[PDB]
Design an enzyme around this catalytic site. Sequence first.
Site, PDB file in Angstrom:
ATOM      1  N   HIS A   1       7.132 -14.235   7.129  1.00 13.35           N
ATOM      2  CA  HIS A   1       7.028 -12.786   6.994  1.00 13.35           C
ATOM      3  C   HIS A   1       6.352 -12.083   8.180  1.00 13.35           C
ATOM      4  O   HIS A   1       6.244 -10.857   8.202  1.00 13.35           O
ATOM      5  CB  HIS A   1       6.366 -12.401   5.652  1.00 13.35           C
ATOM      6  CG  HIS A   1       5.045 -13.059   5.393  1.00 13.35           C
ATOM      7  ND1 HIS A   1       3.849 -12.539   5.842  1.00 13.35           N
ATOM      8  CD2 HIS A   1       4.729 -14.178   4.698  1.00 13.35           C
ATOM      9  CE1 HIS A   1       2.854 -13.307   5.435  1.00 13.35           C
ATOM     10  NE2 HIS A   1       3.361 -14.309   4.738  1.00 13.35           N
TER      11      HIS A   1
ATOM     12  N   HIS B   1      -1.858 -10.505  13.753  1.00 11.09           N
ATOM     13  CA  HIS B   1      -0.405 -10.471  13.567  1.00 11.09           C
ATOM     14  C   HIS B   1       0.056  -9.024  13.679  1.00 11.09           C
ATOM     15  O   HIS B   1      -0.776  -8.129  13.828  1.00 11.09           O
ATOM     16  CB  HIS B   1      -0.026 -11.029  12.181  1.00 11.09           C
ATOM     17  CG  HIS B   1      -0.750 -10.373  11.043  1.00 11.09           C
ATOM     18  ND1 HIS B   1      -1.995 -10.788  10.614  1.00 11.09           N
ATOM     19  CD2 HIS B   1      -0.445  -9.279  10.303  1.00 11.09           C
ATOM     20  CE1 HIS B   1      -2.427  -9.974   9.667  1.00 11.09           C
ATOM     21  NE2 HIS B   1      -1.507  -9.048   9.459  1.00 11.09           N
TER      22      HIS B   1
ATOM     23  N   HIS C   1       3.225  -5.777  12.501  1.00 11.94           N
ATOM     24  CA  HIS C   1       4.142  -5.194  11.518  1.00 11.94           C
ATOM     25  C   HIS C   1       5.048  -4.309  12.379  1.00 11.94           C
ATOM     26  O   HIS C   1       4.546  -3.537  13.199  1.00 11.94           O
ATOM     27  CB  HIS C   1       3.379  -4.334  10.503  1.00 11.94           C
ATOM     28  CG  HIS C   1       2.491  -5.117   9.586  1.00 11.94           C
ATOM     29  ND1 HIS C   1       2.967  -5.791   8.482  1.00 11.94           N
ATOM     30  CD2 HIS C   1       1.159  -5.361   9.629  1.00 11.94           C
ATOM     31  CE1 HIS C   1       1.968  -6.418   7.885  1.00 11.94           C
ATOM     32  NE2 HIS C   1       0.862  -6.173   8.561  1.00 11.94           N
TER      33      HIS C   1
ATOM     34  N   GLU D   1       2.187   0.650   9.241  1.00 15.92           N
ATOM     35  CA  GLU D   1       1.808   0.663   7.834  1.00 15.92           C
ATOM     36  C   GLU D   1       1.007   1.932   7.561  1.00 15.92           C
ATOM     37  O   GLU D   1       1.362   2.716   6.684  1.00 15.92           O
ATOM     38  CB  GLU D   1       1.010  -0.596   7.474  1.00 15.92           C
ATOM     39  CG  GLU D   1       1.817  -1.885   7.649  1.00 15.92           C
ATOM     40  CD  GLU D   1       1.356  -3.014   6.737  1.00 15.92           C
ATOM     41  OE1 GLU D   1       0.169  -3.403   6.810  1.00 15.92           O
ATOM     42  OE2 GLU D   1       2.193  -3.511   5.944  1.00 15.92           O
TER      43      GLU D   1
ATOM     44  N   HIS E   1      -2.955  -6.009  13.647  1.00 16.79           N
ATOM     45  CA  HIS E   1      -4.067  -6.281  12.723  1.00 16.79           C
ATOM     46  C   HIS E   1      -4.897  -7.481  13.141  1.00 16.79           C
ATOM     47  O   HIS E   1      -4.368  -8.616  13.189  1.00 16.79           O
ATOM     48  CB  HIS E   1      -3.532  -6.556  11.313  1.00 16.79           C
ATOM     49  CG  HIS E   1      -2.962  -5.354  10.620  1.00 16.79           C
ATOM     50  ND1 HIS E   1      -2.302  -5.454   9.417  1.00 16.79           N
ATOM     51  CD2 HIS E   1      -2.995  -4.031  10.922  1.00 16.79           C
ATOM     52  CE1 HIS E   1      -1.954  -4.250   9.003  1.00 16.79           C
ATOM     53  NE2 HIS E   1      -2.363  -3.367   9.897  1.00 16.79           N
TER      54      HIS E   1
ATOM     55  N   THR F   1      -2.629  -6.046   2.775  1.00 14.85           N
ATOM     56  CA  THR F   1      -1.365  -5.328   2.585  1.00 14.85           C
ATOM     57  C   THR F   1      -0.192  -6.200   2.147  1.00 14.85           C
ATOM     58  O   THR F   1       0.917  -5.698   1.958  1.00 14.85           O
ATOM     59  CB  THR F   1      -0.938  -4.532   3.849  1.00 14.85           C
ATOM     60  OG1 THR F   1      -0.622  -5.438   4.914  1.00 14.85           O
ATOM     61  CG2 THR F   1      -2.052  -3.594   4.294  1.00 14.85           C
ATOM     62  N   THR F   2      -0.438  -7.502   1.992  1.00 10.11           N
ATOM     63  CA  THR F   2       0.587  -8.443   1.524  1.00 10.11           C
ATOM     64  C   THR F   2      -0.046  -9.243   0.392  1.00 10.11           C
ATOM     65  O   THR F   2      -1.266  -9.408   0.352  1.00 10.11           O
ATOM     66  CB  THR F   2       1.001  -9.470   2.606  1.00 10.11           C
ATOM     67  OG1 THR F   2      -0.151 -10.232   2.992  1.00 10.11           O
ATOM     68  CG2 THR F   2       1.592  -8.787   3.822  1.00 10.11           C
TER      69      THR F   2
HETATM   70 ZN   LIG Z   1      -1.247  -7.055   8.299  1.00 11.02          ZN
END
Ligand SMILES: [Zn+2]
Length: 258
Positions: free
Chosen positions: A62, A92, A94, A104, A117, A196-197
């Site tokens: 992901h 990582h 997004h 995000e 992040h 957030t995941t």
């Molecule tokens: Zn993140």
Amino acid sequence: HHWGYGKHNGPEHWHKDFPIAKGERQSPVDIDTHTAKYDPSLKPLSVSYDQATSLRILNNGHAFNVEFDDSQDKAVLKGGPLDGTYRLIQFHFHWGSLDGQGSEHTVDKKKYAAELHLVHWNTKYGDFGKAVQQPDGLAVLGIFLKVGSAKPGLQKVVDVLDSIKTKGKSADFTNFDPRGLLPESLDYWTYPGSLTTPPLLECVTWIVLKEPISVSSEQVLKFRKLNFNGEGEPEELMVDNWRPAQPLKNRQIKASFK
Ligand SMILES: [Zn+2]
């Protein structure tokens, strides 16, 4: 049928397996610059990454994480709105399928092309495993990415994505300096939230920088070449791996600048 970002397992389905998805301090959120109050009591942020020691890069299905050595106080974050010392463990991104979306968090409803992040854990709890379980266990630094001139410090990362295209692959990745991913100014916004995941635990103190870093169109295009799938399955490109803004529920966002 695990969680993901598709039409039948995306953001709107996460609540069935993880009830906290509809909680009181979820992330991300929109930053209304009209209602985010300057707080004269907030202190300067302290970022110490000079002794940062990287070890590996990996595709988890992901996103891709760059893991660091966290056995000692090498890379630490302190000061600002915090009351302790937090160690860097991984970072990582997004991103979207097009430059018009991908971040995000948002600022006055506007979206950026991607969001970085940097994840750290409070040293008073001993290790990451125990820290994610406490309301003050983590501190995450978020930086927006906007299209423009290429970013020199990001090239080392982009040049290795060839070796980890599908879910499950990894490769050695030593000597990477995260200082090359920071903007010029350290002004910030701050509020209490969550991961957030999934598992979406409400254990995070968020610090979002006001100044975004600039990256080239050609650099972001490479993030879009990775795969969500494993070797030998229906190809599905790793794009649009971001969660939408969540309800604020009487939380207040503070600013370290007028
Ligand atoms: Zn993140």
